[model samples]
Target: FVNQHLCGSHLVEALYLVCGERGFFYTPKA
Candidate 1:
């Protein structure tokens, strides 16, 4: 089974990296 909290953290970090690379920004879900 996957841990959603841990997975979300990594996923969000990856999104930030991709957004930075693409010259865009992200507003994460609250």
Candidate 2:
């Protein structure tokens, strides 16, 4: 369960990174 938690949290972090990266990448073009 701890391993799952680590994986889940990392995935969440990756998602947040991806969202923020894309958000900034497109913000000026929009």
Candidate 3:
């Protein structure tokens, strides 16, 4: 027999590094 499970997870880790540098934009979720 075998058993497995996954708890919670983070759906967003992208810091919009492409724009955040401007210190005026942020990333968003879908």
Candidate 4:
């Protein structure tokens, strides 16, 4: 369960990194 949750968080951060590129930006869901 903990591992799954950690993966989800990491995925979201990865999305942020991708989206934050090319001068694009967004707020991560809290």
TM-score, structure 1 vs. true: 0.40
What is the TM-score of each predicted model, taking all chains together?
A: 0.40, 0.41, 0.16, 0.40
Global CA lDDT of candidate 1, please? 0.57
Q: Model 3 over residues 1-30: C-alpha lDDT tens digits?
A: 013342222212132333355543333432
lDDT of each residue in 1-30, candidate 1, tens digit only: 234453556766766766676764444654
Q: Once superposed on the true structure, which residue ranges of model 1 sit more than 4 Å away at CA?
A: 1-6, 21-30
Off by over 4 Å in 2: 1-6, 21-30
Residue 14 miss distance in model 1 (angstroms): 0.3
Write candidate 2's Cα lDDT for 1-30 as tens digits: 224443455656655676775642322235
Candidate 3: the clashing residue pairs are none
Error of 3 at 22 (Å): 5.0
Question: Clashing residue pairs, candidate 2?
Answer: none
Model 3, which residues run further than 4 Å from truth? 1-15, 21-30
RMSD for all candidates, in order, please.
5.3, 10.0, 10.7, 6.4
Q: What value does the lDDT take at residue 12 in candidate 3?
A: 20
Question: Could you say which candidate leads in lDDT?
Answer: 1
